[PDB]
Amino acid sequence: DWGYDDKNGPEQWSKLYPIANGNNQSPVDIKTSETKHDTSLKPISVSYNPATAKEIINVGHSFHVNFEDNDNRSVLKGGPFSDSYRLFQFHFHWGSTNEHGSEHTVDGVKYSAELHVAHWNSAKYSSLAEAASKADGLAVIGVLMKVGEANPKLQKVLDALQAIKTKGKRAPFTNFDPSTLLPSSLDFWTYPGSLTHPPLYESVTWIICKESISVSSEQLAQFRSLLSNVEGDNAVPMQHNNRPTQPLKGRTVRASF
Numbered sequence: 001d002w003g004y005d006d007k008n009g010p011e012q013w014s015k016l017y018p019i020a021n022g023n024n025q026s027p028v029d030i031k032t033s034e035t036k037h038d039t040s041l042k043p044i045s046v047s048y049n050p051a052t053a054k055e056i057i058n059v060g061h062s063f064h065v066n067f068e069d070n071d072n073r074s075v076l077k078g079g080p081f082s083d084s085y086r087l088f089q090f091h092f093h094w095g096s097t098n099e100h101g102s103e104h105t106v107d108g109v110k111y112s113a114e115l116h117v118a119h120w121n122s123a124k125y126s127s128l129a130e131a132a133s134k135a136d137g138l139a140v141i142g143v144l145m146k147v148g149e150a151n152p153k154l155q156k157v158l159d160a161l162q163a164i165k166t167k168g169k170r171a172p173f174t175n176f177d178p179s180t181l182l183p184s185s186l187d188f189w190t191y192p193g194s195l196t197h198p199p200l201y202e203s204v205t206w207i208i209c210k211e212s213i214s215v216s217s218e219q220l221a222q223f224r225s226l227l228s229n230v231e232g233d234n235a236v237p238m239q240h241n242n243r244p245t246q247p248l249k250g251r252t253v254r255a256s257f
């Protein structure tokens, strides 16, 4: 039983998941004076098929938009990778108020939310289940979301939430290309890290975009109005779901720019 409350939250996760104190934990604070530019990093290349969009689900602590992952219709390539990675999900993290909510921070600056677009290594592994615990198994793009003007690209996502208000509800979510949510520039930082919540596997190559995307105060309010309880129980809004940043433990954050 993990969550984001005071008793089951990030600071207690290590009791059930000792890897929470590991050497490749995420998120991290990116100190830009300590990043190392790497001339070998190629540009990020995403090519997603909107027909792979499948379902939106309320998972209690968050909501997920999942994608069909039976073939290479929707892939991420380039950057630090020599393998192609298959899209399987995107989701967001947010905080209790606008002042925080992102997971990664840049030079100590906290943003209001963060988008995660997750992929698994289909060149090397046969399924997400096999890839999920492998050091080279997962690739996640993180986009920092800065509070400001309403972001119209979020519209379909936001409009879908009324059908998945409570824990366990799910609905079709089709014909959507999440590359439309990415910033204009794909300049990025990369470092070896982990899932940011249990099971916290140290299996993620992180791709953190330099450019933020916008989100309005009211759009964030829609996230926070999702309910963590099951239908019929007392309503418990999903106020936050961002993990604090974790020690780099000697890792190097590389920059593509």
Ligand SMILES: NS(=O)(=O)c1cccc(NC(=O)NCCNCc2ccc(Br)cc2O)c1
Pocket: 116, 117, 118, 132, 138, 140, 194, 195, 196, 197, 198, 199, 200, 204
């Ligand atoms: N971008 S991220 O915030 O680091 C991120 C991306 C993907 C997954 C998670 N963590 C969870 O889903 N934890 C709950 C278990 N749900 C089942 C399950 C699904 C996928 C994977 Br892989 C492992 C796994 O056990 C975090």
Ligand SMILES: [Zn+2]
Pocket: 091, 092, 093, 116, 196
């Ligand atoms: Zn995430």
